[PDB]
């Protein structure tokens, strides 16, 4: 990229990088909290929500 | 003795409803067994529960 930038002035090539912290969590518990239900009909199959 | 008819002041009714995706479906039926009504049409479309 430096040698392309050399050899042009009308156009540029660019290069970055950049590292990822990203911290997952809500303020509280109770804000995390979740539920479900779930049946099994007696043909086998299974209703989730 | 002779029988009997039941007589309910509402007769026989049901509407049945295609939700358009999956095959499922919703059965709104003037019945004394929803389980039963699970079952019958169930297997007369080969589907699950």
Known sequence: ?49 | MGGQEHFYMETQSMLVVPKGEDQEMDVYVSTQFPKYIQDIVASTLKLPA
Do not use: C
């Open chain 1, 1 to 49: 990229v430096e040698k392309f930038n050399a050899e042009n002035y009308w156009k540029k090539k660019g290069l970055a990088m950049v590292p990822l912290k990203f911290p997952v969590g809500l303020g509280s518990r109770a804000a995390g909290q979740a539920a479900a239900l779930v049946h099994i009909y007696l043909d086998g199959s299974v209703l989730v929500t």
